[PDB]
Write a protein that binds this ligand. Structure first.
Ligand SMILES: [Ca+2]
Ligand SMILES: [Co+2]
Length: 205
């Protein structure tokens, strides 16, 4: 009789506010068949005494559930853990559980122990949006006075930064100070800076 639960491999997951993500847990069972997979908090929801998963932005799906041979060591079952992080999501980390059930009623046991991290237990770390990008230097804007850029010069720098950084979000804001220092404000309000020496130079005749 099958008394062995499915085994799971996950990882150490990093996600970023305002950005989408997807990870795949790998699941196998000695019987070769997994009937269900739930990604969940270890504790039940106070409001329903039923399983749940917080933060609410974490979603999951598993194709090919309940079919013979869907979870063998050779061809594992894969559970996708995906979503988009809200711009105001709390910065920090969580440990959550991938909990499959095989064809014989055996369910992987949730065990709160760091030695299970990366197996059925996984860490997900939520970082600010600026941590996903590394702003590129723009083409130099040449200005009449390095201590006092005009509005049009500040406007040209921002356009140059935008041109040099197509990979940053369209909703990221580029502001330029009076000495040409660039601030990039991402949609989640975190920031990056490009120092003036890589942005502006004095205009020669
Ligand atoms: Ca089994
Ligand atoms: Co001059």
């Amino acid at each position: 009789v099958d008394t062995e639960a499915p085994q799971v491999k996950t990882g150490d997951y990093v996600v970023y506010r305002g950005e989408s993500f997807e990870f795949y847990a790998e699941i196998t069972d000695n019987s070769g068949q997994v009937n269900d997979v739930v990604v969940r908090n270890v504790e039940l929801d106070k409001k329903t005494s039923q399983p749940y998963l917080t933060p609410g932005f974490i979603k999951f799906s598993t194709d090919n559930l309940g079919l013979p041979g869907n979870a063998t060591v050779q061809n594992p079952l894969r559970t996708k853990i995906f979503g988009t992080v809200p711009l105001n999501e709390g910065i920090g980390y969580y440990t959550r559980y991938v909990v499959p059930t095989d064809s014989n009623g055996n369910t992987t046991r949730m065990v709160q122990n760091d030695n299970r991290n990366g197996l059925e237990r996984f860490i997900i770390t939520i970082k600010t949006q600026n941590e996903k990008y590394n702003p590129a230097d723009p083409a130099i804007t040449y200005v009449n006075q390095l201590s006092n850029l005009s509005q049009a010069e500040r406007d040209a720098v921002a356009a140059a930064v935008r041109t040099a950084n197509p990979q940053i979000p369209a909703a990221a804001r580029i502001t330029v100070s009076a000495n040409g220092t660039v601030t990039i404000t991402y949609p989640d309000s975190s920031t990056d800076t490009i120092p003036a020496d890589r942005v502006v130079k004095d205009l020669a005749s």
